[PDB]
Design a protein around this ligand. Structure first.
Ligand SMILES: N=C(N)c1ccc(NCc2ncc(-c3ccccc3)[nH]2)cc1OCc1cccnc1
Length: 223
């Protein structure tokens, strides 16, 4: 995450860190004790989910590690255009809830009134390095018209745009699949955006979570 700062230690109990091959791959959101939501482009072998983390460089008493037993990519995900960039991960071990491990409720209304938004993750910072401590930033939703102008013929109804006109606070590589939180609800998932990272004119593009209520519920309730 570029141009942000360290999160408050107790503000992100729903944040997951996804690992493969021993290093940080993506963010993710705990939405149910057995399920983490992330971006479909985070699908890699032997995913390891870490909950209750703040600093990746230290062993924390609140952390919980779980293997993934099932990875459910949206049937209409299109890697080329990033359309429908969403994936459900079923945990081997149900999350042992604590003050630092809690699910985040989903935004079910696509016409939700504007609320204060934020992003977070262990993605690349402004200096080009990967931080041990999770970064946070306030950002605002950008109108669909403004975003269509920023990325012509690239924005679908399955995408939301969000950014920061003042410093260009933005999500980046490694923040993928992390949450766009609006009014204490999951509004979006980190999907794609500008290269290099920065949202002054070309806002970050987020998977529009409100569009996936039925698919999420059907997947979680399946079998
Ligand atoms: N600026 C942003 N808001 C932003 C946030 C997250 C990401 N994640 C990387 C990422 N998204 C999708 C894929 C992907 C999908 C399919 C196939 C292979 C790759 N990879 C990228 C972002 O901006 C572009 C960007 C690209 C690379 C390095 N830095 C920034």
């Amino acid at each position: 995450l570029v141009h942000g700062g360290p999160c408050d230690k107790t503000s992100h109990p729903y944040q997951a860190a996804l690992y493969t091959s021993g290093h940080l791959l993506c963010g993710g959101v705990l939405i149910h004790p057995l399920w983490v939501l992330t971006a479909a482009h985070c699908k890699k072998p032997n995913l390891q989910v870490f909950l209750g983390k703040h600093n990746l460089g230290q062993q924390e008493s609140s952390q919980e590690q779980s293997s993934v037993v099932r990875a459910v990519i949206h049937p209409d995900y299109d890697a080329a255009s990033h359309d429908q960039d969403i994936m459900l991960l079923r945990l081997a071990r149900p999350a042992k809830l604590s003050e630092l491990i809690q699910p985040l409720p989903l935004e079910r209304d696509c016409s939700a009134q504007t609320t204060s938004c934020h992003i977070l993750g262990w993605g690349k910072t402004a200096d080009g390095d990967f931080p041990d401590t999770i970064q946070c930033a306030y950002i605002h939703l950008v109108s669909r018209e403004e975003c269509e102008h920023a990325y012509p013929g690239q924005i679908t109804q399955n995408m939301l745009c969000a950014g920061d006109e003042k410093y260009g606070k933005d999500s980046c590589q490694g923040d993928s699949g992390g949450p766009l939180v609006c009014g204490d609800h999951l509004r979006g998932l980190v999907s794609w955006g500008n290269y290099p990272c920065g949202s002054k004119e070309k806002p970050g593009v987020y998977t529009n979570v409100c569009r996936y209520t039925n698919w999420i519920q059907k997947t979680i309730q399946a079998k």
